[PDB]
Amino acid sequence: SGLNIKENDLPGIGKKFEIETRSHEKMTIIIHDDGRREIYRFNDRDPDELLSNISLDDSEARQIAAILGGMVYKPQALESIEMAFSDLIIEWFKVEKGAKSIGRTLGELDVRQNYDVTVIAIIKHNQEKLLNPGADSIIEENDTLVLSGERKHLKKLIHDFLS
Amino acid sequence: LNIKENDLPGIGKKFEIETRSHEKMTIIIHDDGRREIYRFNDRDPDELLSNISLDDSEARQIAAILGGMVYKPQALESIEMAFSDLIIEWFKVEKGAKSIGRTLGELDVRQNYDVTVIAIIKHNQEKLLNPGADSIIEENDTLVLSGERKHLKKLIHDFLSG
Numbered sequence: 001s002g003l004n005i006k007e008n009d010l011p012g013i014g015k016k017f018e019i020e021t022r023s024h025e026k027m028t029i030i031i032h033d034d035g036r037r038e039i040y041r042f043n044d045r046d047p048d049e050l051l052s053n054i055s056l057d058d059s060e061a062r063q064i065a066a067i068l069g070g071m072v073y074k075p076q077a078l079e080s081i082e083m084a085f086s087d088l089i090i091e092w093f094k095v096e097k098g099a100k101s102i103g104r105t106l107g108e109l110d111v112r113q114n115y116d117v118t119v120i121a122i123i124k125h126n127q128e129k130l131l132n133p134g135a136d137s138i139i140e141e142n143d144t145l146v147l148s149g150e151r152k153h154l155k156k157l158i159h160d161f162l163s
Numbered sequence: 164l165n166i167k168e169n170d171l172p173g174i175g176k177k178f179e180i181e182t183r184s185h186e187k188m189t190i191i192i193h194d195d196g197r198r199e200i201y202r203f204n205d206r207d208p209d210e211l212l213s214n215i216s217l218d219d220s221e222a223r224q225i226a227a228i229l230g231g232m233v234y235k236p237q238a239l240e241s242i243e244m245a246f247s248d249l250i251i252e253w254f255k256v257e258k259g260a261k262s263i264g265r266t267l268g269e270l271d272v273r274q275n276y277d278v279t280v281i282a283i284i285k286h287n288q289e290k291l292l293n294p295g296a297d298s299i300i301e302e303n304d305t306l307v308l309s310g311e312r313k314h315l316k317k318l319i320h321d322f323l324s325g
């Protein structure tokens with residue numbers, strides 16, 4: 001996966017965070033017990049070469065975090081559901097005991113056609129990651145469904161086949 | 164800890180930060196969530212020590228470390244992490260895209276490309292929460308795709324691009 005972050009506990013000192021971004025840029029963060037934050041910027045091709053170091057206290061680290069975390073200025077046009085589609089909701093629902101969908105596939109239910117709920121991915125009982133479920137995907141008990149739709153439409157599907 | 168904030172019209176806003184130890188850094192925050200950080204010398208503002216480019220996910224995850232906060236992933240982010248090779252990509256159709264004019268049903272995406280369209284931002288900024296088979300695709304439509312790496316690359320090459 002992306003954004004590798006290694007966390008080591010330095011005994012008597014604090015926590016060390018070795019970070020490598022998606023842009024293959026190195027960066028190390030130290031968090032001392034007293035709350036001090038230390039940041040190290042290393043070369044992209046040479047981990048030995050230190051390009052920058054900075055020491056901050058807890059209060060200072062927060063004021064920078066609040067800026068970097070979009071809490072002082074929220075990025076307007078984010079490409080997330082919460083930012084773009086206000087009324088869109090994703091729910092991770094498990095097929096309960098007395099359900100009426102246990103057995104039949106998605107092409108045999110027409111959920112997107114009937115409930116306006118689109119299934120994105122499925123975690124079945126044997127933890128087999130199902131990337132993009134199709135019309136010929138069987139639905140067993142204890143399977144986890146990653147759904148997409150409106151609050152009203154999701155509850156309708158839950159009330160019927162899911163729960 | 165002194166902080167100066169200026170407006171960046173059409174880009175976002177920048178944050179110039181100077182510490183008590185005269186260590187200076189500037190945070191550029193784009194509206195699309197892109198972060199750009201630049202480290203400057205204690206006396207020479209022309210000297211660029213180091214820099215790093217982050218997105219919204221990376222910035223909020225680093226900020227969670229800097230601050231005493233807990234990182235809470237967005238809905239799409241949680242999906243991508245959970246399902247290893249499941250890629251969620253937002254694409255906007257090109258000039259002469261073959262998909263333009265056709266509907267999702269006519270193209271038959273999830274059966275021929277194994278790709279699920281989660282949501283669509285239509286040109287006129289109309290939110291299409293649940294794209295069905297009768298959902299028409301025109302130019303400048305922002306589609307939220309949900310498929311494997313191999314599958315997405317052919318879907319754009321065949322219909323979305325141009």
Ligand SMILES: Nc1ncnc2c1ncn2[C@@H]1O[C@@H]2COP(=O)(O)O[C@H]3[C@@H](O)[C@H](n4cnc5c(N)ncnc54)O[C@@H]3COP(=O)(O)O[C@H]2[C@H]1O
Pocket residue numbers: 106107108109110111112113114117118119120132133134135136267268269270271272273274275278279280281293294295296297
């Ligand atoms: N938002 C969208 N995302 C991706 N592809 C889209 C789409 N809207 C239309 N299509 C394409 O057009 C066909 C129309 O399916 P429809 O939604 O009428 O009817 C669907 C639906 O009622 C049901 N179905 C199967 N898988 C589903 C899923 N993951 N989520 C929801 N419904 C599903 O079975 C039919 C599946 O047809 P199939 O996938 O062979 O073929 C689909 C698909 O290839």
